[PDB]
Amino acid sequence: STAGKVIKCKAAVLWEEKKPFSIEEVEVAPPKAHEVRIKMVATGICRSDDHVVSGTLVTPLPVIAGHEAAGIVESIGEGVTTVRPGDKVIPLFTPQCGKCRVCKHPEGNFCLKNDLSMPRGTMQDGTSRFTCRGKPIHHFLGTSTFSQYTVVDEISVAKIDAASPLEKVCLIGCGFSTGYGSAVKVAKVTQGSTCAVFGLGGVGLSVIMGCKAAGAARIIGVDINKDKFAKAKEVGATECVNPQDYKKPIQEVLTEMSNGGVDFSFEVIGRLDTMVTALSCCQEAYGVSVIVGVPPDSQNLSMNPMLLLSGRTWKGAIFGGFKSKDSVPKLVADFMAKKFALDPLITHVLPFEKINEGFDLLRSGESIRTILTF
Amino acid sequence: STAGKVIKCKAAVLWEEKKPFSIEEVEVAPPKAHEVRIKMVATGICRSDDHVVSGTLVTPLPVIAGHEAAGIVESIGEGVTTVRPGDKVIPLFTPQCGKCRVCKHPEGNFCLKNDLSMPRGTMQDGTSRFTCRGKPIHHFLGTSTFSQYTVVDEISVAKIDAASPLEKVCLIGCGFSTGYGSAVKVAKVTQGSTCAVFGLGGVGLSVIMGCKAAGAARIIGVDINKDKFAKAKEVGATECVNPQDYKKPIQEVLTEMSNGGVDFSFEVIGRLDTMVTALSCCQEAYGVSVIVGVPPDSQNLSMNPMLLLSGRTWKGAIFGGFKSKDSVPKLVADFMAKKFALDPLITHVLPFEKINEGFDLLRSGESIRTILTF
Numbered sequence: 195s196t197a198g199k200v201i202k203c204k205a206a207v208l209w210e211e212k213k214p215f216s217i218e219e220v221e222v223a224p225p226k227a228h229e230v231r232i233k234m235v236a237t238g239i240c241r242s243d244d245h246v247v248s249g250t251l252v253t254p255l256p257v258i259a260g261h262e263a264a265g266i267v268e269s270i271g272e273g274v275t276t277v278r279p280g281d282k283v284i285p286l287f288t289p290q291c292g293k294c295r296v297c298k299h300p301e302g303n304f305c306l307k308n309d310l311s312m313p314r315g316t317m318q319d320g321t322s323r324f325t326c327r328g329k330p331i332h333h334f335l336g337t338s339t340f341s342q343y344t345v346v347d348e349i350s351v352a353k354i355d356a357a358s359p360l361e362k363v364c365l366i367g368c369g370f371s372t373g374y375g376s377a378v379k380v381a382k383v384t385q386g387s388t389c390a391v392f393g394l395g396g397v398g399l400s401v402i403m404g405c406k407a408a409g410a411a412r413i414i415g416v417d418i419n420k421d422k423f424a425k426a427k428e429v430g431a432t433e434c435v436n437p438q439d440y441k442k443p444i445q446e447v448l449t450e451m452s453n454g455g456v457d458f459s460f461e462v463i464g465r466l467d468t469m470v471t472a473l474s475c476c477q478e479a480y481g482v483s484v485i486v487g488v489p490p491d492s493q494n495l496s497m498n499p500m501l502l503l504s505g506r507t508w509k510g511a512i513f514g515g516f517k518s519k520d521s522v523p524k525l526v527a528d529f530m531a532k533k534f535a536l537d538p539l540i541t542h543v544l545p546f547e548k549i550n551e552g553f554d555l556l557r558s559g560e561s562i563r564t565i566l567t568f
Numbered sequence: 569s570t571a572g573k574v575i576k577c578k579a580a581v582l583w584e585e586k587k588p589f590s591i592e593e594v595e596v597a598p599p600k601a602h603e604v605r606i607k608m609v610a611t612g613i614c615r616s617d618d619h620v621v622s623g624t625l626v627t628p629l630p631v632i633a634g635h636e637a638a639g640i641v642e643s644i645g646e647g648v649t650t651v652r653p654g655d656k657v658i659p660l661f662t663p664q665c666g667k668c669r670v671c672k673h674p675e676g677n678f679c680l681k682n683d684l685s686m687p688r689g690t691m692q693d694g695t696s697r698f699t700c701r702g703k704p705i706h707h708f709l710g711t712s713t714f715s716q717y718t719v720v721d722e723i724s725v726a727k728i729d730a731a732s733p734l735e736k737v738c739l740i741g742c743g744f745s746t747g748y749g750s751a752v753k754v755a756k757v758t759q760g761s762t763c764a765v766f767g768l769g770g771v772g773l774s775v776i777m778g779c780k781a782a783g784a785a786r787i788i789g790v791d792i793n794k795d796k797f798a799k800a801k802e803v804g805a806t807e808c809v810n811p812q813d814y815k816k817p818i819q820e821v822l823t824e825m826s827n828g829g830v831d832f833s834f835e836v837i838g839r840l841d842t843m844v845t846a847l848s849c850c851q852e853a854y855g856v857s858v859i860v861g862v863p864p865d866s867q868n869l870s871m872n873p874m875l876l877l878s879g880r881t882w883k884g885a886i887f888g889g890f891k892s893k894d895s896v897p898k899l900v901a902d903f904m905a906k907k908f909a910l911d912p913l914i915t916h917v918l919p920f921e922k923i924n925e926g927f928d929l930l931r932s933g934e935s936i937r938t939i940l941t942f
């Protein structure tokens with residue numbers, strides 16, 4: 195009864211930076227060739243969505259944000275072969291076109307069809323499927339999940355197990371898979387190693403889960419909010435440190451604690467200073483440091499390249515290095531088989547209409563991952 | 569007839585920065601426990617020795633520099649078990665104590681006994697074996713090869729094949745092994761890949777040799793001195809580019825030439841800007857960049873961490889990543905088995921007394937690696 199027709203529904207529109215979302219009616223066009231329209235069931239609030247509000251992460255406005263979500267296919271455009279109406283799906287903020295050099299490379303996952311490097315805020319075809327007050331509204335990362343319905347390109351959606359609990363597995367669309375993969379795929383944490391994790395939010399906790407799954411002997415959580423420490427320990431941290439408790443810079447503290455530097459460190463905050471601190475705290479000859487946090491737009495860090503010349507490895511990654519469409523269904527299958535837990539990350543549940551309260555909870559430091567239900 | 573006695577011999581003393589070496593008589597004390605005195609046969613002129621003269625590399629002065637060399641053991645101190653008088657040996661500017669956490673790690677080679685991180689310019693016991701005009705003179709990297717005789721710690725010397733030609737294998741003491749290992753061990757260049765090498769001196773040419781040995785399909789040499797291009801092609805480069813010939817930044821040129829970025833890049837010059845350019849020219853999702861060149865003292869580079877967040881890997885290494893005492897004898901054996909060539913690196917051979925002429929050749933752009941013969 196809606197296939198081929200415009201859907202009027204509620205969405206959370208961001209009209210300008212540093213303002214509350216506006217919950218109001220939008221028009222969602224029907225899918226074009228190779229597009230899929232999704233009825234949203236649940237979406238997480240990730241710090242990257244807040245970065246759009248704050249101007250840390252620049253993408254065109256006005257916009258429908260939201261990228262960590264799960265829903266049910268309402269209809270498919272011509273030529274779609276990988277999902278059908280009624281299927282449970284997770285939108286992919288990093289596409290997997292399967293055809294570019296990156297998709298073909300064994301390690302790479304940052305598909306060249308992504309809307310991160312040169313943001314347009316559109317569908318792959320350079321147009322939008324959203325109108326609000328008669329005005330076109332931008333998409334975000336080809337997902338836009340803060341809406342009762344969205345339209346995504348086929349390369350930006352994965353079909354998942356029909357018995358999946360969507361109010362949990364939405365986290366596989368971003369924060370869990372990013373943190374977990376950063377440890378197990380990008381860093382390749384080894385048995386018996388010492389790890390340091392900077393930032394103990396939903397992504398930082400998922401890095402800890404991955405370090406523990408890899409068999410690290412020590413996992414040192416680092417956060418300036420000591421309220422984050424109890425849950426970090428529950429999911430695997432062996433110790434936690436608050437830099438503001440020390441007279442010395444935390445790189446020196448962590449080097450001392452690890453008898454000369456950690457094996458693996460992770461920046462999971464988004465600050466230039468902690469990216470350099472995290473590099474410095476890994477062992478100078480064989481340490482590895484992974485940047486996960488998002489830096490403020492266009493800003494450069496400063497660092498001494500002798501930190502690398504001694505033998506450190508520095509890398510970053512999007513989405514935990516996972517090739518998104520191949521990996522999301524397998525991660526859902528692993529969750530259904532109890533291979534990792536998502537409940538530790540979910541501290542609050544709210545209806546979609548209370549989105550602004552959910553962002554207030556994140557900004558206050560009180561939540562890890564609020565899940566919004568449509 | 570010299571064992572146990574002070575040797576008076578000639579050496580090239582650097583009394584202050586930005587002056588010629590002074591060729592004059594020095595006194596070399598006999599080796600103490602766990603020390604080895606070596607009669608020098610050949611030593612190369614590396615850019616790192618010039619960095620001491622120019623102040624790019626800070627180490628205590630006055631100093632006997634030189635670190636890329638080969639000689640014959642004249643005597644051993646009490647307790648030495650790994651070399652004996654008459655053995656051919658290469659001094660190791662990165663020691664291999666075998667007992668620290670780095671020596672025990674499968675990947676690491678920057679042994680914690682090194683004199684690079686916190687330069688003291690002494691023997692391991694904190695004293696010097698050199699006197700000149702009655703003044704104590706510092707050591708350099710535990711080697712000090714610009715002298716007819718030197719004294720090194722046992723952990724800073726390797727015994728090599730008694731039939732090895734020392735006027736060639738001295739390059740395995742630094743420049744060849746550094747560049748070759750930077751490609752084959754640190755970057756782990758893959759078959760069929762595209763590489764970019766910034767800097768076509770002795771070390772960059774050895775990176776090219778390593779990329780070719782690893783089966784790279786394309787090897788792009790980058791240098792502002794086009795006189796370096798002919799020899800770079802002889803040893804494996806498929807193309808060379810001079811940044812000065814282009815209106816656009818060379819990272820943009822290399823990205824276009826490689827249809828979206830190279831697989832592996834190497835900075836083998838020692839400039840902050842070319843370290844950032846080499847990182848940028850590797851493919852953003854799966855590229856790897858290795859810093860080999862030595863930065864000017866105490867200076868920081870500036871970079872945008874989104875270069876790493878997309879997926880790049882940035883690393884650096886000392887001495888090609890080779891564990892020094894284990895690897896140098898094997899590299900000499902490989903050379904004797906014709907597995908790689910050293911003659912392409914050697915453009916000039918001069919008596920030791922012409923050391924300053926050798927440095928003038930390096931600074932003018934005319935030489936790759938002058939070998940000084942004692």
Ligand SMILES: NC(=O)C1=CN([C@@H]2O[C@H](COP(=O)(O)OP(=O)(O)OC[C@H]3O[C@@H](n4cnc5c(N)ncnc54)[C@H](O)[C@@H]3O)[C@@H](O)[C@H]2O)C=CC1
Pocket residue numbers: 240241242245368369372392393394395396397398416417418419422437462463464465468485486487488489511512513514562877
């Ligand atoms: N690379 C990728 O693909 C992804 C990157 N992100 C980014 O990862 C980062 C973390 O995201 P979430 O876990 O959702 O954020 P979050 O805000 O819940 O967690 C960040 C933590 O960092 C702590 N923190 C803030 N400043 C600190 C400081 N100076 N020192 C030590 N701790 C400090 C906070 O107290 C907080 O607990 C964000 O920058 C996000 O945008 C998130 C998912 C995907």
Ligand SMILES: NC(=O)C1=CN([C@@H]2O[C@H](COP(=O)(O)OP(=O)(O)OC[C@H]3O[C@@H](n4cnc5c(N)ncnc54)[C@H](O)[C@@H]3O)[C@@H](O)[C@H]2O)C=CC1
Pocket residue numbers: 503614615616619742743746766767768769770771772790791792793796811836837838839842859860861862863885886887888936
């Ligand atoms: N990481 C390690 O263990 C080692 C580091 N080094 C360092 O590696 C570097 C290279 O050493 P060598 O090959 O002996 O030096 P070299 O001086 O013979 O070669 C450097 C090359 O860089 C070129 N060059 C200079 N400025 C340039 C620019 N803006 N753009 C492009 N090319 C430029 C020069 O024309 C020259 O051909 C030096 O910094 C040296 O100190 C050397 C050996 C060991």
Ligand SMILES: O=CNC1CCCCC1
Pocket residue numbers: 240242243251261287310368488512513
């Ligand atoms: O949080 C989800 N996606 C992020 C990935 C890192 C760059 C900004 C967008």
Ligand SMILES: O=CNC1CCCCC1
Pocket residue numbers: 614616617625635661684742862886887
């Ligand atoms: O060239 C030999 N050794 C170099 C190694 C890199 C730091 C400066 C000294």
Ligand SMILES: [Zn+2]
Pocket residue numbers: 289290291292293294295296297305306307
């Ligand atoms: Zn692709």
Ligand SMILES: [Zn+2]
Pocket residue numbers: 663664665666667668669670671679680681
């Ligand atoms: Zn050691």
